[model samples]
Target chain A: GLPRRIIKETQRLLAEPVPGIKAEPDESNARYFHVVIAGPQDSPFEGGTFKLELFLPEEYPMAAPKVRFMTKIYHPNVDKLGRICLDILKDKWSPALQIRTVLLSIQALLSAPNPDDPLANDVAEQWKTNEAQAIETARAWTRLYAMNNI
Target chain B: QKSVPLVATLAPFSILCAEYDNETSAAFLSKATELSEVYGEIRYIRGDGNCFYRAILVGLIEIMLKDRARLEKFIASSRDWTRTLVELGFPDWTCTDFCDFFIEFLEKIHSGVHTEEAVYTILNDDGSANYILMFFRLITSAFLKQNSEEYAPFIDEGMTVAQYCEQEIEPMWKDADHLAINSLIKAAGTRVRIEYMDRTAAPNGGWHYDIPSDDQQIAPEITLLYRPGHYDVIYKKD
Candidate 1:
């Protein structure tokens, strides 16, 4: 069962959209949220609409929300399956953060990719050795899988 | 059989099947009895994965906190260890604050900055406790990540050492294994002994493994009683 606080939070997010993020709760399940994030303007993910599936565990405020990208993203920090290596999303997560904060963090992660700490090991290595080449591949992938018309 | 005797202090952690019954539990408590006699007083760290760190932290601090000289020496050494987070690529802003929290907790205990009760309250506090636990987790990860080549062979399951630490060793609530303990002991200068009381037969119904191996003359200061899935802290009575 979704907590009353989370339900209220969900309703509020749907009604009042944040600058770059919009979320719609699943019809059958209130715990699952279908999230759309507008990629940060000045990064490899620019003009890309990233889809993320976010779910709240029973331990909501106590534990972090489980989230992964539905749309493929090319970055050292995000893996092939779209699992992110962001710290705040994992161990650094505190109850102080909510769905809004998580979305904002992910959006920030898109703007500044972290190659040093990475889930996609090979991509991180490529990113470390050749930044320009990596961003080119990232842009190319964004065009291929992330663009709406494509 | 489920009703416990309610004899033990229940200091944050306590044992089930309260008395040692050799026949029941298929010799689970039977062996626990044989080892408890040798170990003396066992403190219970909750079954959560942070059990290893919690046992070691309390073990040293409980003994050293009252003694000014030992407390100062330990604080000096431990304060320096926190700096390792930076070398391991943790951001300075968040990392330094946490390192200070851990070190600051020790200093507060020594200086009586936070009342003794307040210190215990925070360690038992979930959110506050994880802040410290996460730092130790990173220290263990950094040690393994830094010395990957030396330690990888022992833990290698076809994954890189960093990957293994991240998946198996790093996460909160992930039980500490031999590899994790090895990193903890070496990195933090904490000596640990785990007395095994599992179903596996020892010639005398019990056996023990010392951290950092017998090569290091450092004897086990903190002993943990290990059952199948959980570990509880045990102390030397003599």
Candidate 2:
């Protein structure tokens, strides 16, 4: 039987969804979720919908969820395989955290890209070296890849 | 058993001396010798970052198991704390489940079905052990949050109590600092006397730091040995 905590969190997520974010559990696996976050307004990723996959491990609350970006994007903290370098998703994780907070943090990451702590060094270099050009590339990528599905 | 389980079975304090047989530090060996005289035995808890929580919980349970009145008071207080945790904004379901696991274990102990071996087995069991530690961590976090103003100054500058908890208190293996230790004691309304066995030069041995200070000459029911970052429960001779 599914854990009651997961069931309750799922119900609450669907009922009171966060603004600019959506998460739906997979049809076959309740632990796996398909998530989407709209890029924050006034950011380079604006007007784009980014997809992500989140999987809760066997030790759901004890362990942090495994998440990866399914949609390609140019960001300093997000790598080629869509792995994000976030503290909460790694060593700073807590059992009290939930899917909604995780996605919201991810959404916040998109708005304020931290080049100093970069997972994608190349993007980070450009972001620090020529930010205007990097923003142009991010905007182009958003139009080319992210806007099509929306 | 197999090479010292997590929260190992009670053993003679001499085992601590044997553990540092090859130690080159004169201070550590001297402290060890002095500690052996003060403490009759020691329960060698795992060096996992959760050692303080694990050791404290085991010590508290052992104390509560022997006293009937304290045990019942603890049970009622635990149930009350469960409600308090939810009010402090912990996820109701997860907090409730962890508390239930804790209360059930206390009830089992109260029912007189536990043995030394059984208690060791349950503590070594990952599922049960983690649940108990998680519950305690939440309780500590809640206490820190509720008393943020008092604790905030102790935290690193420019960080709020909520951020400090998210980074330090709530996460497993984050290890307990002085702030976390004080909060855990106050939150649970329990007393812990920790004997510091570090390399601090002392004429006799290491120093003693009691939670909430021992100004009134009160003795702590649970006494832990703090060797820098790690903690282990030490027992006294009856």
Candidate 3:
């Protein structure tokens, strides 16, 4: 059986603002969450609203949540499919990284994408060679994927 | 010149100064003479004709001590290029990327070829090119195995490596019209070559041979400098 107490606690924390980003429950799914992070001002991604999907695995805390980008983004550290090249999510993961911390990390990722350790080599190359074009592509993707055709 | 008579306490100073003057009068001064000599190079002309030789010696000593301290600090702070990389967040990422790639490469090689010795021997025999190819193959195979759904994001409508290089890498260059994106395409081709070499050479430990340095020069025009022990790629600027 799942740890009901941990889930309740996580739910309580998620209900509040975590690192200035709003984390809300998905309207349809209880286990799944829809997150809206205000773009970090320092980055080219500023003023853009990004969406993320957070799924609590069966073995939560012991295992990291399966976080994916609901909104398509052009980034070096993030692959075309929105898989993040974050140390904490992989081998460097600490048990201390909670839902809030992971969300904040994702926000940080948006501001400073590590092209050196890139999931998308082309994107990384583009980011280094032509930053303006990369920013435009990222902005376009944000509009296309996050704006909900509005 | 007035030579002051030596008192009982000043007798030692008189003797030392006499010894220093005798040795250093157009002759090489010994350690004893050098130690006793306290003559200031520049004598300040002050009121009452008093000289500040002691003050000058003290200032010289301070300057020498400060210089020695600075030299010691510089020596202590000096480090190798690899140490700099370690400081700049390379070691952890390198280990993680290597571990991830190694695990996948090892599994693939073991399934196909059983012996680790054969793998090591073959890798050592072939240069860096063979190693790089092996790494490329391992990464490609791993990506294919683990990320079928994620692959779609990397590929667009009818996008080949050539097209990707041209569309993504070429136009980004300031002098794109003058330079060919073929260099990058060739570099990627070299990566494929290394992959082929690895698959053929070492089955088990061949993963360890996946060094990118040898084949890095294949596309010199691209100028992508591969970090030896890390996953990060650095570009060289003119």
Candidate 4:
């Protein structure tokens, strides 16, 4: 079980709205959450509302929560299955991370994808060699996957 | 049955073994004895059934040699094997930071001595270790100190400092987007401005801000000018 303090803080963030984020309680479990973020403006992913699945691990503060994209988005740093390759989410994770910070980091990752270290190899190659095509693909994915209700 | 001593005498650095069956123990003892001919003594025991023997043999030497430099050197050289041990996920028994420092120190020594194997090993492991963040800051500061005087005339009062940085500095970093670098430069400039304003107000009676606890305190402002291509904060006094 999560400590009382972390639970209280998580509950507080859920109740109060933060910019560029919308979250809902998990239907089956109280500890899990579903989050939606309007992609940051000024990036290829702008105007997309991306969904993400967030679940608190049993260890909570000691271990990082599992975060995977529920939306089908295309990016160099995110795999076809929507798994992210950010260091902070894995080995570099510090216990100081909170929901707001993680969401903001995800938004930042979308805006400035590091093609040098990418999860999707083809997307990374395209991003490096043919940026225009990559941007177009991202835009197409946004329109196809994000704009309409699935 | 012939009477035998209950405990065996252990050697300082030897391979010792005991096992469930005599065959396994005998085989292990033979290998240990063979290796011991080259590396020293091999101690073998049967049926005492105490696990503490191995621990007593290994643990006492480790404790005794904890402060010795040769042991530090051995640990430093064995990082790959140590990392494997770490990845195998056993409880850590040695000081990780000290071992890392020893390796770094050894790398510096090898670089200085020009040992081919040591040089290659250091290069393979951490080729760019010398180019620490502080070293980059120093290089940037040196470049700015040299060129700022030359470029001072071109940066007129009418243009925003950001405009000057974008026009004069952003190109040097080979930044694809001069605008993004310009934004970071401008943000850094704001911090500089606040610090400068605070300093100017310090001599005269001015608004005082509450100081946070030591752990919460922000680092002292680096009194340095920014240089292109590197993130350097130069202290004016230094």
Candidate 5:
């Protein structure tokens, strides 16, 4: 039995939709969702739609929802396998955070990529040493992979 | 619990230092004053899962700003802990990213490129602070796991070291204790002096303990205030 707080969160997320991000929960599980996030304007990921999968574990807020990118995009903190190294997904997670905030954060990350906390080491090195190339390649990948967002 | 409905509003995890007043309950304020007669102006850490690591983060930087030779030696040896993390089973990608952030923070501090206030800003923010906290937590977990044979006798109610870590240490907002302090200080090759303020009968108004056995070759460079489950930073005039 999921907590009432989570049920309310689902309803609120629908009611007050986050800008540039859309989340649709699966019929299979009340906790699972298929999400699409638009890349922020003036960012490498701009003009693209990125797909992500989010699953609410039995623990919900106590344990953050499991999230991973489905569409391939080049970013320092996101790995080739689509795994992410954002702190909210790991140790920094708090019970107060919700899905809308999480998706918005992803959108923000697209806007300002942090090369120092890289999930892809090679990509991160290029970003640190050669900034212009990293952004250009990232934009190219977004175009190749996610021209039409799911 | 006061002035609220049945629903308890959780304190959002915000770690800010400047916002902390020298005033609290008069006893706590007086407590700091008398204690400063011995220790100095205490830098209060906000109550959250990241207190200990946050304390050490500020504490160590304070040490380096005072003594270059001492700070340089500690940073050199502590860099090896990243390798230790790889051996201890942290995934390389995540682990190295944290190491990179941690090293850059220290390097910036060491180079005099940042001020004390700027350093505080980095630790207060979640994105950078959590990575630094995670680096320390990983070391503490690995240390506890390997030393489980010794800690086993102390374990009760049937819990293994790994399980103990997952429940007690790895999660955010879980404050530190003797074992955690020992592992973190030892891993970093520096130490701290923590003054415990509690109901315990006090001569200096409370009791105190150093991370390394007080007589262990060197003394604590960083000093802190420990009140029951939480810790706040303290300064001592040498």
Candidate 6:
């Protein structure tokens, strides 16, 4: 059941879109969304375009939304499947966090990749063992997968 | 799967003794015996991480039904708390529905049309109950942020007040610790007395922790029995 809170959140998100991120729900399913988050400046993903799919499950607000990157990028916290390892997306999720805030956290995560707690073992190993090379690899991936639109 | 009600029907105090054994048996039974002198019943709140908020709510609601003055006071303070949350940087849109539902519930109580049966129905329903609980969580978060200087010292080192709220206070299943309880008491303007029942060898079972301080002149509006990680409302003998 779609609660009034979801409706209001959808209205507010559309009326005032967050900078660097845009989320538009599908016409058939209001809960399903197509998201595009612009890479943050100074990061390897900078000047690249990233696509993600967001689905508000039946237990949204009570439970965190399911989000995954459709555009591939090399990051320790993101696995090959595009799943993220940020705390807020899991145990730290609060009903107070809206879609905009969640995307903002994801954007911030791109700027600072945490190798200590990571989803991709190989990516994290490279990030920790050889950071410069890892950045270069990430830059290369961004150019190939994320910057195709540009 | 059948869902667990947010608040269960009234259960007896003796039921707690069966849940423990020899190592903790004497402590719990002794405390139950002592509690029976002052308290007649124990209302079991679901062990969901929102137990503290839910326990305090139903307990407070029962009290408000009898004391219209206190209900009005809470009705006023709840609105003030909303303003406080908005000022503390919580977007109005995010908090609007939860706050509105909470205040409306209070107003219904104030109108004298609410019955214990209707209250039980609403409390048992997850939708209304969780909305009320979320509003309480927001109040706790807003209070901690507003008085960060006093509360920050208790937070884990290296974590800011806002960060702590996002992780600990705002999350749905996050257990409420002493910091959350203290903020709740101050923010909601309600008093709580928790009777601790643990394996400790303290006399008369464990000690009682009264929020705001044990020396407060006013009697607590709600009394709860604290057994390790869980909390349940304890009713006093009339």
Best by DockQ: 6
Q: What is chain B's TM-score across the candidates, in the order shown?
A: 0.80, 0.91, 0.17, 0.18, 0.76, 0.89
* Tens digits of lDDT, candidate 5, B1-238: 1232211122221221223432356675566556656753555566566678777876776777778787677567557777776786755544566577777888888898988778767776665667677767766776777677877666567788767776666666777755677767776667777776543622235377767676666667787766644566765565
For model 1, residues A29-52, the per-residue Cα lDDT tens digits are 989998888878989888888899
Residue-level lDDT of model 1, residues B166-231, one tens digit each, is 676655666767678778778777677777766363223537777767676767777776664456
Candidate 2, superposed: residue stretches over 4 Å from native: A116-122, B1-4, B20-22, B112-117, B199-206
List residue ranges in candidate 6 displaced over 4 A: A118-120, B1-4, B18-24, B199-206
Q: Write the per-residue lDDT of candidate 6 for residues B134-237, one digit (tens) a residue.
A: 99999989999999988788889879998888888888888987788788878877788888765362223447777777564888889988766568898888
Q: Count the clashes in each prediction.
A: 3, 0, 5, 4, 1, 0
How close to the true structure is residue B154 of candidate 6, measured as C-alpha lDDT?
Answer: 86
In candidate 5, which residue ranges exceed 4 Å CA deviation?
A: A1-63, A66-150, B1-33, B199-206, B214-217
lDDT of all the models against the reference? 0.71, 0.84, 0.43, 0.47, 0.71, 0.83
Name the candidate that leads on TM-score: 6
RMSD of each: 9.4, 3.0, 30.2, 23.9, 18.0, 2.8
Superposed by TM-score, candidate 4 places the C-alpha of residue B99 at a distance from the truth, in angstroms, of 27
lDDT of 2 by residue, A1-150 (tens): 677778988999889988999899999999999998998999999999999999988887778899999888998888889999898899888777777878888999999988888344888999999999999999999988888774
Q: What i-RMS does every model get?
A: 6.2, 1.4, 16.3, 16.1, 8.2, 1.1
Q: Which candidate would rank higher by TM-score, 3 or 4?
A: 4
The CAPRI classification for model 1 reads as incorrect
Q: For residues B1-238, could you state the per-residue lDDT of candidate 2 as single tens digits? A: 2365778777898777666423468877888889888889988888777887888888888878679688899989999889998898877876788899889988888887887678778889886888889888988988998898888788897689988888888898888877888888888888888887763622234387777765787789789887654578999887
Stronger candidate by lDDT (3 vs 6):
6
Model 5 TM-score on a 0 to 1 scale: 0.54
lDDT tens readout by residue for model 3, B1-238 = 2332110111232243243223343322243234234321211111111111111212222232335553333223222222332443332332233234333434334344535444434333323212222222222222232333544355567775434332432111112110121232222222211111122332233322232336454432211111111111112222
